Amino acid sequence: TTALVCDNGSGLVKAGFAGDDAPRAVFPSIVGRPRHQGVMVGMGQKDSYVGDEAQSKRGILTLKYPIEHGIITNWDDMEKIWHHTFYNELRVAPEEHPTLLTEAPLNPKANREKMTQIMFETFNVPAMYVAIQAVLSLYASGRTTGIVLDSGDGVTHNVPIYEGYALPHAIMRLDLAGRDLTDYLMKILTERGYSFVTTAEREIVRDIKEKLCYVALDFENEMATAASSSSLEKSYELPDGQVITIGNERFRCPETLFQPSFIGMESAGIHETTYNSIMKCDIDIRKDLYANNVMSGGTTMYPGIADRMQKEITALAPSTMKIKIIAPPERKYSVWIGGSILASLSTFQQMWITKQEYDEAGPSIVH
Amino acid sequence: TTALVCDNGSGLVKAGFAGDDAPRAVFPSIVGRPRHQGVMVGMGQKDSYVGDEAQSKRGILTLKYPIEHGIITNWDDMEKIWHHTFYNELRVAPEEHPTLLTEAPLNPKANREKMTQIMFETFNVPAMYVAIQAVLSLYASGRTTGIVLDSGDGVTHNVPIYEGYALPHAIMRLDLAGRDLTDYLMKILTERGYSFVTTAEREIVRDIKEKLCYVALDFENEMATAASSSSLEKSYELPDGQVITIGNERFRCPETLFQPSFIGMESAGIHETTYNSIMKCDIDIRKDLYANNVMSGGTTMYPGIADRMQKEITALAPSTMKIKIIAPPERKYSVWIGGSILASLSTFQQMWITKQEYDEAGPSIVH
Amino acid sequence: FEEAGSTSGGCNLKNKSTQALEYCAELLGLDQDDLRVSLTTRVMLTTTVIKVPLKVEQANNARDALAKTVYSHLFDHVVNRVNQCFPFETSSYFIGVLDIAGFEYFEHNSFEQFCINYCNEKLQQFFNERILKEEQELYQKEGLGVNEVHYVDNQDCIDLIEARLVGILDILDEENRLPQPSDQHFTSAVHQKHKDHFRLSIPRKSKLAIHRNIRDDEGFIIRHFAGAVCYETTQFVEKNNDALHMSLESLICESRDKFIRELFEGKLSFISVGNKFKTQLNLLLDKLRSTGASFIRCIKPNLKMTSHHFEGAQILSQLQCSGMVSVLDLM
């Protein structure tokens, strides 16, 4: 049997077998219990709706993302995510396949152990391994050097890798993008009188965060032309018939990635965390970290990136240095195409942690 | 078959067959193990990188010169130097050629024995001989009298030879130049705020020790003009984009060869060790040691030598004596062009130690 | 194909290759703007249908993969057109002639000669298998009955070249999957997994001076029935790598020309290139096992190819390269 790559998204959990095209299942991670009393008599209602069904049944449930700030809320809901994914999307039994699971870089111990341990006893997989989402994006882009960005709602990361070794002393985790950008967009859309305070309605905010937002070339000059009469406004239509016109806030929300002072948080922008991680690496290596700046994750899919990022880095970086920023299409599925390449390779079959070895070793094998 | 002259450099190991042009392989002697963990999965990484590959992979390894203070660190790394040199540079089997190996003058016993013995059993050469690097520089310059200088990182030597006999009572070994000049340059470049403390980065220091340094005509008068506003500064560019401007220290570092009090060591300068070795020879011979002062080794390739050396010796030497200091181009390959002339001559074929004779005699044949 | 200007990654075509594309697309019956996308992108779906650009080296291998697909189906169209010039009335029993090149090798051997000598080693296995069966039914026919005879195996040479995960063709096809393929990593991986065995040595172990000039990571020596044959590894992976993918396979089939569509009658992306050489050969070896056999070995007596000249320094080399001497060892 065929191995299964299942990505523990922050979004947007992604699932598909090993090779060779695209993921089979992608869905918004949400679990939602019903906040109102039923009067139908069937009864016909589920105890907890997962996505996609919880995104079709908005407004009668209370949506709860099971992974928040890069860590799982409880494994009771997480197990339901897994069960739903394997059985009613992929249509496969875990006993049939070796699996490949993903994690986030700088995640607290003992949450990789507890995960691995529960998943082996609950789903009875014959072998498993847990890879960080950032490393996998190297394979997806066909690179062997560069700084890797796993940016999902709501934890971004900046990991530098050099042919083909990782540098522990320069790894940066920012809790900045993207769920706090969702919350910030909701705070500056209230300023235009649209009240979307409720949990369900927050998903609609997320959808306009995808579609209508853009990044400026320079903030001050976009603000200048905003003061002018020329329309930057785009009109969105809402499920109850309402028409929302956003303009100024449209470029304000993504600009936060370069200026976190908009949220009021002390942390520095992607601009400077890129530079400061490069300048924590040895002198000879710095040469090839420039021009292997590879963006990844769905929250980097705004149009004005990477050429904003490019212009800003080129201004702070040493003169006459070659800087190219690598941003392909499909960054949301980058991780999955990474994992797919990995699990197909020899000899990594023998790098998987198998059940008998796990049973003897216990949680200490993980690291 | 054609004999092979392989020079046990301090630098800068040099290799090429006997006659008639130039060496085929020159490389920086460094072996370097990888100091960081690999994450690529290929795996594709070597256990120990030798030069040139260890000079292309700086900053992810820890460079270790295998010969230090004129003696080899261990024969485990030395054998890898040899194996790399014969096989992946020269493309020749040792069983095909009689070899000619070099050593340093005043090197401790039993390190010529142990070398000879290991090389015969490991590489199975049919015959061998070991010549000191200084004697070979006589042939290279076409002389038969004179004081010979083997100066490499980090042991210099002063050997007097008279037509065509060697004088044991006047041989001087100074542990002064050049690797301690590398370390001293790193200590006076920190004074200008550039921190190059790491092993890899030390090679960059060595490269600026080659290119940018110069020797003064007189220290005090160069120091005078240094106090003036006129620029002695040269701007170097560094692999990560940095621009380094050195001036005062530029002539300070090589001047150490005439004044070791800059390092704080008690030993006297090349000036005085030249004079004091001449004045340990018999009266009639002193006449022809003057004007056959022949410099050799790459660490004598600074521009202000030999005419600094000339002016200083002429001041200490007796009045009206003819003094000429012989310093041709290509001093770094002097030794190799020496060895080449030697191994081609009859009857020195019958001076080689052959395998059957070595097997009967054992390590006692060496001397 | 040059490198794209940082905009979305990938590769673009060179400006010197613009009029060269215009004069090529009318021979293939396709549009020049759609062919430029198809030679640079990986078309997939998210179900919208997105276009994800490829790297420069993957586009040079994909452009040559189109030429190794169009000419491959053109030779299969010539043979099928010839078989339609004499259609068979019916089928039942058959007497056929298999003709192929013998054990052919040069001073420095290539990937093309590696597949010939691998094909002759599998045919050498079936050759000695049919000889032993004829001798066992000769002894029975003369009334001598059964007796013990020693058989020589060459399965260890076959497992070396084609075994799953550990074979030479299996490492070669895996190297294509790596994010950065190498030929120095391919050579070192062969003596990584096969450190022992007698059918394989380093080039410097050879008695021949020309083979002793080859560096450890530049080649290898594989012993076959006809002896020790060295192969260099430069360009070996490049010649194996083929990358015909969806975005280009579903474009040459979609041609506006009718003769082109007649030539071509998600998953798998890059496909398995080192497997097509093993898979197609197994369709002939089991057909040869299902029939009887009549082995006719053909001898060239002299280099000039002129009448009444015998060269015993060239004939003896063909007795040892035909497998004839091996069968005399068996007997």
A165 to B43: CB separation less than 8 angstroms, yes or no: no
φ, ψ (nearest 5 deg) of residue B84: -60, -45
Give CA–CA dist A88/A15, Å, rounded: 12
Which candidate in A165, A344, A352, A367 is best for mutational testing of the B interface (most B CBs within 10 A)?
Answer: A165
Beta-strand relationship, B293-295 and B146-149: parallel
CA distance C278 to chain A (A): 19
Residue A366: partners with Cβ closer than 8 Å, 6 or more residues away? A112, A113, A116, A130, A353
- Looking at residue C304, its amino acid is K
The token pair that represents C171 in the structure block: 């490492």
**E strands present in A35-93:** 49-50, 61-64, 67-68, 71-72
Nearest residue of B to residue C171, measured between CA atoms = B42
Helices (H) and strands (E) in chain B, counts: 13, 20
Q: How was this structure determined?
A: cryo-EM
Q: Cis check for the bond before C31: say yes or no (omega within 30 of 0).
A: no
B37 to A284: CB separation less than 8 angstroms, yes or no: no
C204 to B87: CB separation less than 8 angstroms, yes or no: yes
Task: Provide the angle, in degrees to the nearest 10, between the axes of the packed helices A334-344 and A133-141.
Answer: 80
Q: Which of C102, C11, C101, C108 minimizes the C-alpha distance to C56?
A: C11
* CB A133 within 8 Å of CB A151: no
Give CA–CA dist A342/A349, Å, rounded: 9
CA distance B298 to chain A (A): 25
CA distance C185 to chain B (A): 6
A22 to C8: CB separation less than 8 angstroms, yes or no: no
Which residues are bridge partners to B236 per DSSP? B244
A318 to B60: CB separation less than 8 angstroms, yes or no: no
- Which H or E run contains B313? helix B307-316
C64 is in an annotated binding site: no
Nearest to C177 among A325, A330, A344 (CB): A344
Beta-strand relationship, A67-68 and A61-64: unpaired
Q: Residue A165: its chain B contacts at CB < 8 A?
A: 34, 36-40, 60
A19 to C269: CB separation less than 8 angstroms, yes or no: yes
* CB C216 within 8 Å of CB C202: yes
The token pair that represents A185 in the structure block: 């967009």
Residue B164: partners with Cβ closer than 8 Å, 6 or more residues away? B144, B145
Distance separating the N- and C-terminal Cα atoms of chain A: 27
Q: Which of C296, C297, C295, C299 minimizes the C-alpha distance to C316?
A: C299
Nearest residue of C to residue B41, measured between CA atoms = C178
SS3 call for A105:
coil
The number of C-beta contacts closer than 8 angstroms across A and B is 71
Contacts for A158-161: CB closer than 8 Å, 24+ residues apart: A158/A270, A158/A273, A158/A274, A158/A277, A159/A105, A159/A132, A159/A134, A159/A135, A160/A277, A160/A278, A160/A281, A160/A289, A161/A135, A161/B39
Nearest to C51 among A138, A310, A329 (CB): A329
- Looking at residue A15, its amino acid is A
Q: Residue C10: its chain A contacts at CB < 8 A?
A: 328
Helices (H) and strands (E) in chain C, counts: 14, 7
Question: Resolution (in Å) of the shown entry?
Answer: 4.6
Give CA–CA dist B300/B147, Å, rounded: 14
B87 to C216: CB separation less than 8 angstroms, yes or no: yes
The token pair that represents B150 in the structure block: 């083997």
Q: Residue A324: its chain C contacts at CB < 8 A?
A: 6
Which candidate in B50, B84, B91, B95 is best for mutational testing of the C interface (most C CBs within 10 A)?
Answer: B91
Q: Which of B355, B367, B350 minimizes the C-alpha distance to B124?
A: B355
Q: Which of B103, B136, B100, B148 minimizes the C-alpha distance to B10?
A: B103
Q: Residue B38: its chain A contacts at CB < 8 A?
A: 164-166
SS3 call for C185:
helix
Chain B residues in contact with chain A using a Cβ-Cβ cutoff of 8 Å: 34, 36-45, 58-60, 196, 198, 200-201, 204, 238-242
Cα-Cα-Cα-Cα dihedral sign, residues A78, A80, A83, A86: negative
A20 to C180: CB separation less than 8 angstroms, yes or no: no
Angstrom CA distances, A204 to A124, A212, B126, C37, stand at 38, 12, 83, 35
B239 to A283: CB separation less than 8 angstroms, yes or no: yes
* CB B131 within 8 Å of CB B138: no
Which residue in the block uniquely carries the two structure tokens 């963006």?
A295
Give CA–CA dist B166/B132, Å, rounded: 12
B91 to C213: CB separation less than 8 angstroms, yes or no: yes
Neighbours of chain C (3+ CB pairs under 8 A): A, B
The token pair that represents C125 in the structure block: 């296995």
C46 to A19: CB separation less than 8 angstroms, yes or no: no
Q: Which of A314, A269, A270 minimizes the C-alpha distance to A291?
A: A314
φ, ψ (nearest 5 deg) of residue B135: -55, -40
DSSP B73-93: S-HHHHHHHHHHHIIIII---
The token pair that represents A298 in the structure block: 């769905």
DSSP 8-state code for residue C109: B
Which residue in the block uniquely carries the two structure tokens 């785009």?
A234
Residue A139: partners with Cβ closer than 8 Å, 6 or more residues away? A337, A338, A341, A342, C179
* CB A96 within 8 Å of CB A1: yes
Give CA–CA dist A142/C317, Å, rounded: 48
Nearest to A328 among C52, C178, C269 (CB): C52
Beta-strand relationship, B353-354 and B325-326: unpaired
| Helical ranges in chain A per DSSP H | 53-56, 75-85, 113-123, 133-141, 179-189, 199-211, 219-227, 248-255, 270-278, 283-289, 307-316, 334-344, 355-361
Give CA–CA dist C307/C289, Å, rounded: 38
Residue A195: partners with Cβ closer than 8 Å, 6 or more residues away? none
* CB C136 within 8 Å of CB C146: yes
Which residues are bridge partners to A71 per DSSP? A68
Nearest to B59 among A282, A320, A321 (CB): A282
Q: Residue A306: its chain C contacts at CB < 8 A?
A: 6
The token pair that represents C292 in the structure block: 């009887």
The token pair that represents C274 in the structure block: 């080192």
CA distance B40 to chain A (A): 5
Which residue in the block uniquely carries the two structure tokens 């256990």?
B47
Nearest residue of A to residue C56, measured between CA atoms = A142
The token pair that represents C247 in the structure block: 């975005």
Named by the residue before each, gaps in chain B exceeding 2.5 A from C to N are none
B200 to A282: CB separation less than 8 angstroms, yes or no: yes
Which candidate in B86, B88, B97 is best for mutational testing of the C interface (most C CBs within 10 A)?
Answer: B88
- Helix, strand, coil abundance in chain C, percent, nearest 5: 50, 10, 45
CA distance B35 to chain A (A): 9
Cα-Cα-Cα-Cα dihedral sign, residues A8, A14, A19, A20: negative
Give CA–CA dist C288/C278, Å, rounded: 16
Residue C81: partners with Cβ closer than 8 Å, 6 or more residues away? none
Angstrom CA distances, B230 to A127, B215, B225, C68, stand at 72, 18, 8, 68
Residues in chain B: 367
CB atoms within 10 A of CB A144: 20
Give CA–CA dist A86/A110, Å, rounded: 25
